[PDB]
Amino acid sequence: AEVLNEDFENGIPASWKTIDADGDGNNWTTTPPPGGSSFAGHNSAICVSSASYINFEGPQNPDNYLVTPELSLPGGGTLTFWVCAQDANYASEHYAVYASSTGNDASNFANALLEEVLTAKTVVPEAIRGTRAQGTWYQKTVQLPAGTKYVAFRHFGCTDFFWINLDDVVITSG
Numbered sequence: 001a002e003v004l005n006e007d008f009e010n011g012i013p014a015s016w017k018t019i020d021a022d023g024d025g026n027n028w029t030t031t032p033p034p035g036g037s038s039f040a041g042h043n044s045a046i047c048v049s050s051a052s053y054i055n056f057e058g059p060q061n062p063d064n065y066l067v068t069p070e071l072s073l074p075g076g077g078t079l080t081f082w083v084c085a086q087d088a089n090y091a092s093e094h095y096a097v098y099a100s101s102t103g104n105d106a107s108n109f110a111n112a113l114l115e116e117v118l119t120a121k122t123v124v125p126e127a128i129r130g131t132r133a134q135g136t137w138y139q140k141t142v143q144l145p146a147g148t149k150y151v152a153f154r155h156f157g158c159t160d161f162f163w164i165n166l167d168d169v170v171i172t173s174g
């Protein structure tokens with residue numbers, strides 16, 4: 001039974017929450033600057049994205065969370081989602097996925113269930129990035145413990161690549 005299935009085609013839903021932990025005003029977003037329109041989604045128009053580098057601005061130091069609405073997983077569940085680097089040639093974005101059994105603030109998200117740096121399969125030094133191919137979309141699977149109330153996706157601990165993209169977040173109970 002699916003308890004969450006988000007394609008982002010109507011943007012980040014109001015039921016989800018962004019946390020700008022570094023405080024720069026830049027978040028996970030479906031309107032990445034300076035274009036202000038979503039990057040190409042996974043077999044779809046829209047995905048949600050966070051920047052380590054913004055064209056016409058420069059390197060960023062993100063600590064950005066994207067948090068689900070409150071979940072009921074009394075016996076646990078399974079998360080799947082799709083992730084890619086927006087620029088296949090500046091691919092090395094660092095992210096983690098966390099579960100909380102209580103609240104939905106940054107301090108509630110500790111002990112990553114998954115933490116990785118996307119694999120660079122190709123590389124280029126350019127001021128304007130995102131000018132070639134998107135990275136490959138990869139599906140990830142994370143098991144969620146019983147009593148998980150919130151899942152957070154965190155883009156952090158990296159700078160000076162381009163953007164990380166997320167799409168097609170599905171959580172099933174059991």
Ligand SMILES: [Ca+2]
Nearest residue numbers: 007041044046
């Ligand atoms: Ca989508």
Ligand SMILES: [Ca+2]
Nearest residue numbers: 020022024026
């Ligand atoms: Ca930020």
Ligand code: NA
Nearest residue numbers: 004005006007
């Ligand atoms: Na949906």
Ligand code: NA
Nearest residue numbers: 014015016017
């Ligand atoms: Na919200």
Ligand code: NA
Nearest residue numbers: 102103104105
């Ligand atoms: Na709260």
